[PDB]
From Swiss-Prot, chain C:
Family, similarity comment: Belongs to the methyl-accepting chemotaxis (MCP) protein family.
Keyword terms of this UniProt record: Cell inner membrane, Cell membrane, Chemotaxis, Membrane, Methylation, Transducer, Transmembrane, Transmembrane helix
Whole sequence portion shown: 1 to 155 of 551
Name by which UniProt lists this protein: Methyl-accepting chemotaxis protein I
Organism whose genome encodes this protein: Escherichia coli (strain K12)
Gene name of the encoded protein: tsr
Coiled coil feature spans: none
């Protein structure tokens, strides 16, 4: 009974927190803190999950900053074409007025 | 297979095995200790029968000795040969010794008899005791009345040897039964040796297999999931992920697959 | 506190305990029965000493009882009263009864001697046995020599 209660607290509860962590991480929640108790079997998995979780924040974080650069950069080019298009019509009308002036 | 149950449930059954072997094996020793106690219980009773019966048989011999001395003391008085204890004092000793035979024999009837004893032998020894007891009691009346002539013409000599055969046969009977009680000790003493050497071979054999069962249901699936996190974190997303039953290892593999 | 060790290390350490408990528990159970066997070694020997001593002591009484009939049979022949077995046959029966005590007593001296037995008691009982044995032997010569008077005054 003593060993059955000790293993239960050092196998069931630690494992349950690791399983739930992957569910929250799989769903997108990358905020659930994670801890490591000792260097046993459960300790290696916990330390391994922390390393994998960090790659998600770095990948999602890097893609977020990089994705915004494309939208911001594309907006500058799109805004430039809008202004360039308007100026093109003004210059185009000059040819019509200039052409009629030569007549 | 263990995949259809939890890991903690399997470990409980493993520890329950050693707990069951202790109770089952322990119950056998309790039987040996119990049967061994019954041996001394019967051995103790058999000895009390000899002790109580010995004092009774000795009382008959002591009584017969006093009657012999009383008979000679009576004949010596006729021819006048020295002197000593009167006949009244010698006959009194026979009466005292006669009561001891009943007292010692009374205990023999109170001590419970074992069931493995011959019922016929108990009747022969008791029958000869009554004929012998009544014989010595009659001698006290013949000598007291003065019929010394008929005192020597009695069949008391035949009754003395008659009960002696039953007495010796009864003592030798308990001697053979006493050996059976000793054989019972060697039985319980031997069973404890085979059970001891037997259970240990079974316990040590199970422990040799429990090591493989633990690794084949804990260290094996656990390391597979730990390594999977390394490949997924390192970039290798080709190695599939298999489910290990519905236990905790299967839930993680299923959740990790998503 | 099992948290200071691994899960596998805990089981391997517990499995070794069960192997030790079974050995120690089974050892005490076998040790208890082993002590019982030592008792039977004494009980097996005490029954022989009592049996050999009983048969020997019973032989001494039967020997005296036989010599008593020889003395009576010897006196009755003088006054001529009835008839029966001659004195030579009665004295011969006492001799066989005397040797029966030596046979039963000879085996007693060959049986073991446990340390929990009163050594002093064994010497006192043997001292009286030697005097008793020699006493019954002297009765065979006194009766044969015709000393019927002194035959009844012996110690």
């Amino acid at each position: 009974f003593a060993v059955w209660f000790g293993i239960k607290a050092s196998l069931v509860a630690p494992m349950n927190r690791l399983i739930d962590s992957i569910r929250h991480i799989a769903g997108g929640d990358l905020v659930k803190p994670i801890e490591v108790d000792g260097s046993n079997e459960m300790g290696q998995l916990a330390e391994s999950l922390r390393h994998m979780q960090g790659e998600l924040m770095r990948t999602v974080g890097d893609v977020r900053n990089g994705a915004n650069a494309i939208y911001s950069g594309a907006s500058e080019i799109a805004t430039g074409n809008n202004d360039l298009s308007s100026r093109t019509e003004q210059q185009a009308a000059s040819l019509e007025e200039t052409a009629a002036s030569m007549e | 297979m263990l995949k259809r149950i939890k890991i903690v449930t399997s470990l409980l059954l493993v520890l329950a095995v050693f707990g069951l072997l202790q109770l089952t094996s322990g119950g056998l020793f309790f039987n040996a200790l119990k049967n061994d106690k019954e041996n001394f219980t019967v051995l103790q009773t058999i000895r009390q029968q000899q002790s109580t019966l010995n004092g009774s048989w000795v009382a008959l011999l002591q009584t017969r000795n006093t009657l012999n001395r009383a008979g000679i003391r009576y004949m010596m008085d006729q021819n006048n040969i020295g002197s000593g204890s009167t006949v009244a004092e010698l006959m009194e000793s026979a009466s005292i010794s006669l009561k001891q035979a009943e007292k010692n024999w009374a205990d023999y009837e109170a001590l419970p008899r074992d069931p493995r004893q011959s019922t016929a032998a108990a009747a022969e020894i008791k029958r000869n005791y009554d004929i012998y007891h009544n014989a010595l009691a009659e001698l006290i009346q013949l000598l007291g009345a003065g019929k010394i002539n008929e005192f020597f013409d009695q069949p008391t000599q035949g009754y003395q040897d008659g009960f002696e055969k039953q007495y010796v046969a009864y003592m030798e009977q308990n001697d053979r039964l006493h050996d059976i009680a000793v054989s019972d000790n060697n039985a319980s003493y031997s069973q404890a040796m085979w059970i001891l050497v037997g259970v240990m071979i079974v316990v040590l054999a199970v422990i040799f297999a429990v090591w493989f069962g633990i690794k084949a249901s804990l260290v094996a699936p656990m390391n597979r999931l730990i390594d999977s996190i390394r490949h997924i974190a390192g970039g290798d997303l080709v190695k599939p992920i298999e489910v290990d039953g519905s236990n905790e290892m299967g839930q993680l593999a299923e959740s990790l697959r998503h």
